[PDB]
Amino acid sequence: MLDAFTKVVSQADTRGAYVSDAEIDALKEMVAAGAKRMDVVNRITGNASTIVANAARGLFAEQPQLIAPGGNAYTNRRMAACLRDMEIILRYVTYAVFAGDASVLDDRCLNGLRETYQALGVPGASVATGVSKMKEAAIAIANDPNGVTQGDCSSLMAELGSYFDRAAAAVS
């Protein structure tokens, strides 16, 4: 996997190039904001069960056919599998935020997931809806102004949203 620093290195190495002054300054900006990045990881991690439960409750309220008899999330075994999938996707999203790069999420979670769901008959578009609901829940928790030093996390929340959006796109 890559992190933000080694993503820049790898792109430069492909070109046989030194990392530019502009690229290094962009990495210094990431470093300067590192405490806020770690708050995002910490808050989502500490509230993972709530994010998954609230997203699932929203998904099944919008798509009752998933939980009706014959639905893909009907029976406790299938519901448990579905909750586990949402928790897995959330875990890899927290790794992407920590590292500042999507490579771990692509390589260890999303690559081949569409085909996996197609073969199981898991409705990918409904997984994408659940992922979008986890995004809303996770941003609400991560971006809660209570109990943190006040300041701007807008960039980090957009980056966090991008990782959820990449997951939703990979399964739909």
Partner: protein, 162 residues
């Protein structure tokens, strides 16, 4: 690629778990180290051509046979001198990458993995490169935390060659 951040993720992922406070503290330590390392990378980068020119000449001085003996492996021809300058340029560039990455990943992935097999196959002496690296260590012109950082990665490469 190995960095303190990728190592932390790999650890958590190996255990099927979310990141812990210990891994967030690893990231804080990497962030504290970063701005000096990113300065060292800036320093080395602006001096790279000078350092490559100098390290090449230091190898040729210590091992004069490399400039005179005939053979595919020697800098006794223009194309041989160009291969040598290129290789020395690779070490300098990849050490700058380590200062950006905050760890040995770039050296490990791009240069050290396979290094022994390549030096054997193409009959390149590791001693030539160790001399180029001692020169780079003496002439990079950094001090304080940047210099410790840069020297850690130069010593790691010398150790890989020895």
């Amino acid at each position: 690629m190995k960095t303190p951040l990728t190592e932390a993720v790999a650890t958590a992922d190996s255990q099927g778990r979310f990141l812990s406070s210990t891994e967030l503290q690893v990231a804080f330590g990497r962030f504290r180290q970063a701005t000096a390392s990113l300065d060292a990378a800036k320093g080395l980068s602006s001096k790279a051509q000078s350092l490559a020119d100098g390290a090449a000449n230091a190898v040729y001085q210590k091992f004069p046979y490399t400039t005179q003996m005939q053979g595919n492996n020697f800098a006794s021809t223009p194309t041989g001198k160009a291969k040598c300058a290129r290789d020395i340029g690779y070490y300098i560039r990849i050490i700058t990458y380590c200062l950006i990455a905050g760890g040995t990943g770039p050296l490990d992935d791009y240069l050290i993995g396979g290094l022994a097999e390549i030096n054997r196959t193409f009959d390149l002496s590791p001693s030539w490169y160790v001399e180029a690296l001692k020169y780079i260590k003496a002439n990079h012109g950094l001090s304080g935390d940047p210099a410790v950082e840069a020297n850690s990665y130069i010593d790691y490469a010398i150790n890989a060659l020895s």
